[PDB]
From a paper:
One example of siderophore piracy is the uptake of ferrioxamine B, a hydroxamate siderophore produced by many Streptomyces species, by the specific OM transporter FoxA. FoxA belongs to the family of TBDTs (transducers) and is involved in ferrioxamine B transport as well as modulation of transcriptional cascades in the bacterial cell. Here, we determined several crystal structures of FoxA from P. aeruginosa, in the apo state as well as in complex with the siderophore ferrioxamine B and TonB. Our results indicate that the transporter can exist in several different conformations, and that both substrate- and TonB-binding is required to form a translocation-competent state of the FoxA transporter in a two-step TonB-binding mechanism necessary for transport function.
Author numbering: 144 to 820
The structure:
Amino acid sequence: VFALGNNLGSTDGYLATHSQIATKTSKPLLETSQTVSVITREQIDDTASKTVQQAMRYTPGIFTGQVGASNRYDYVVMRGFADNSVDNIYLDGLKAMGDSGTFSSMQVDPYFLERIDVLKGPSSVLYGRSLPGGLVALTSKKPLYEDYRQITGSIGNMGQKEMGFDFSGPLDEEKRIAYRLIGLGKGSDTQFDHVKEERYAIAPTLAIDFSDDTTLTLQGYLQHDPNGGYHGGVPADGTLSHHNGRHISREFFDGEPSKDDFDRTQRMFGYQLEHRIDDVWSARQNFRYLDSDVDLSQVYAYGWSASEPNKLNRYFSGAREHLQAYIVDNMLQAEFATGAARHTLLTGLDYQRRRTVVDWRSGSASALDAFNPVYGDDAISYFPDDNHTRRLEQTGVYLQDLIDIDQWRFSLGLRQDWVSVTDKNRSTGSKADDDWEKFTGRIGALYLFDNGLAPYVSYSESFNPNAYSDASGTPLAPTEGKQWELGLKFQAPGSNSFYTASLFHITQENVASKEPQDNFYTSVGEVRSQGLELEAHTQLSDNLKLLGSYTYTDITYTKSLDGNQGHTPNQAPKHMASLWADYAFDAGPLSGLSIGGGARYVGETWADKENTLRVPDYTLVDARIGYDLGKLGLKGLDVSLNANNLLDKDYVASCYSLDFCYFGEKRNVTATVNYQF
Ligand SMILES: CCCCCCCCCO[C@@H]1O[C@H](CO)[C@@H](O)[C@H](O)[C@H]1O
Ligand SMILES: CCCCCCCCCO[C@@H]1O[C@H](CO)[C@@H](O)[C@H](O)[C@H]1O
Ligand SMILES: CCCCCCCCCO[C@@H]1O[C@H](CO)[C@@H](O)[C@H](O)[C@H]1O
Ligand SMILES: CCCCCCCCCO[C@@H]1O[C@H](CO)[C@@H](O)[C@H](O)[C@H]1O
Ligand SMILES: CCCCCCCCCO[C@@H]1O[C@H](CO)[C@@H](O)[C@H](O)[C@H]1O
Ligand SMILES: CCCCCCCCCO[C@@H]1O[C@H](CO)[C@@H](O)[C@H](O)[C@H]1O
Ligand SMILES: CCCCCCCCCO[C@@H]1O[C@H](CO)[C@@H](O)[C@H](O)[C@H]1O
Ligand SMILES: CCCCCCCCCO[C@@H]1O[C@H](CO)[C@@H](O)[C@H](O)[C@H]1O
Ligand SMILES: CCCCCCCCCO[C@@H]1O[C@H](CO)[C@@H](O)[C@H](O)[C@H]1O
Ligand SMILES: CCCCCCCCCO[C@@H]1O[C@H](CO)[C@@H](O)[C@H](O)[C@H]1O
Ligand SMILES: CCCCCCCCCO[C@@H]1O[C@H](CO)[C@@H](O)[C@H](O)[C@H]1O
Ligand code: NA
Ligand code: NA
């Protein structure tokens, strides 16, 4: 059974019925007063989404182009909040624990995942430090109680190859002990010259039921990326416009192949302990330890040379980082009635502790011709080293009551967080050290009509430690998010279809801002994001499945000291939409065959915060064809062909500023063979 900390419910095709993302306890999506999306394993496989970030491309309120084609980190911009977008990811109910002030952000390979859940808007009441756009919760594959065996292989353009396995089953005749073991090896050249991606990973899991009341699940996840793909950008000047009659190529590499390394090792161990005390009382402990090593060498472009016409100026970043992090969450839940009201009352204590030891290097590199570059001039003039030890501790105590009474579904939550952040500059010996407390709250009310229509309203809050520091090196006050949301969900009690609309108004306060003059930031900035999201899952008779989305987002610097007050953040489309369909033939000659595809639309974006130049809009097309060869008498064998960006559009995905613009992925074609046995 076991509601606490579990999604439960069911999924069919692309549609899940329940989640725990918004509540830390299984709750129908239809009866949850927040916007929640779920991306199923089937959707991930059918769209050939090769990373978490790419899996989100059909979900509303999410921009998946922050660094264009790069696959090194998962950047999920939610409701237009791009800053600290690498810190939006949770895994098995626990913050991933990367350090967004360093190069040590972790990445979870999609092959380990059963599903991806997305919660929109401020959500600190259950999770503590987090961003005002929302957060993403990955659920890993868990042990199965019947023998399961899959082997999978892929080949594609851009030198892509991948082999994986996924084995699961009971170890004892009683089916009380079950294992899963998943492994993978993959590689790609990318679109970019001289670049490699490569990964090897293994994830063992063991689940043991001590009785009907207790389950312990033991988890390991070991991942080695000896190469890190591409993570660079070039000027707007020759991408969004010609530069002396030319455009920089979408395959251009601005670095030095002899001095281009990204080596990331992620070692995780953890456990989940689920204990039913009573039909009333349940308790759960989720734990994860993380230890990672990252080594980086990168020569990158930064603007055009003032003396040499078609050459880009370049610089060098170098890093050796070691991250350690502990995270535990302790939950105790009472479910009980008091006359006509049912209460699901949760109390929790969570604890995060992170240390990141970083040795950073930087310098000046030789200039490079942006067309016809000549590689090999890799000498760096180094600038002064910059070594730090960065520490974070967060303790949270939280309370939530889900109250169902008649057709009303109410949610009430409060959390107190004690946060301590320290940054020891090991080069200079000086130490910044700060401590503070924050209280966050949430209130939701939803009315469930018996035809399956559910209007709701939610008020919800968030906070996050400020990435900036003041006139004394001491970090500014944490940023804060506050959101009003009004929504409507619909599922007809018949259907395997689900439809939602959400309207939102988010304010983020204490954002760092400064006059151009000054060197010190103050926490007087404010950002406002408001808009509309529409999501539709329409599934007809187990052979035609559709998903579609529309997003309207109006985000603005409502208070800024730097000249940009009233401007729109860059990397924030006002309009996005998407539509994906998949058709399976089930009888007749063609049976076993499936055809699918979709289109994604991203509206215009500002290339810069000064709002002087637009990144054009783009529409991308995806397609798939699958065949179950079991129909020719080889059960468990199937093949598929995918093409993302089928028309091979060559475009700029977004820009961070006028200096750094990113190309979108070219056409990506993969062929896959899956063997069950
Ligand atoms: C956490 C990773 C653990 C990997 C486990 C190795 C694979 C399982 C070992 O073989 C299994 O032994 C059992 C009898 O003892 C049988 O039930 C089963 O039929 C048989 O195939
Ligand atoms: C669990 C079993 C794993 C099996 C391994 C599958 C293939 C892994 C591909 O790795 C590497 O890709 C690089 C980048 O393109 C190439 O430079 C290199 O030549 C190649 O060796
Ligand atoms: C303000 C108090 C904060 C809430 C405390 C939450 C306690 C939950 C601790 O974990 C659970 O507790 C059980 C104890 O019975 C054990 O089975 C096991 O440790 C785990 O399952
Ligand atoms: C609650 C028990 C968790 C302690 C061990 C892992 C915590 C994650 C960060 O590790 C760091 O390890 C250093 C060891 O030299 C110490 O400075 C200190 O422990 C901590 O800053
Ligand atoms: C062997 C590793 C697994 C251990 C399981 C940890 C038990 C859960 C209680 O967490 C504790 O919460 C406190 C908040 O008051 C922190 O101050 C303290 O440091 C932290 O440890
Ligand atoms: C059972 C959970 C209780 C909290 C556990 C953490 C140890 C006590 C925290 O003391 C300190 O108090 C300061 C102001 O008084 C806060 O601003 C700051 O964050 C914190 O360092
Ligand atoms: C954000 C919206 C606020 C909703 C207002 C609170 C509704 C309380 C739940 O009870 C409802 O209303 C009557 C109140 O007396 C009851 O008689 C009856 O049980 C039920 O119909
Ligand atoms: C295509 C556009 C779809 C619009 C989607 C948003 C619908 C939000 C409804 O929320 C409800 O609003 C009513 C009036 O306030 C009240 O019943 C209550 O306040 C609140 O529960
Ligand atoms: C538009 C989507 C539906 C939600 C509507 C709820 C009311 C929105 C207004 O919110 C408030 O507006 C003021 C603007 O300065 C401030 O009081 C504060 O910053 C903010 O909290
Ligand atoms: C479904 C397709 C409809 C497309 C209509 C084109 C409008 C594109 C909107 O760009 C936005 O225009 C605002 C001023 O109008 C700027 O504030 C905002 O800064 C900017 O991002
Ligand atoms: C649902 C399946 C749709 C199949 C897509 C048809 C287009 C096939 C052509 O693509 C190109 O093939 C080259 C090698 O032939 C690659 O090197 C190149 O990089 C790739 O762009
Ligand atoms: Na929400
Ligand atoms: Na990689």
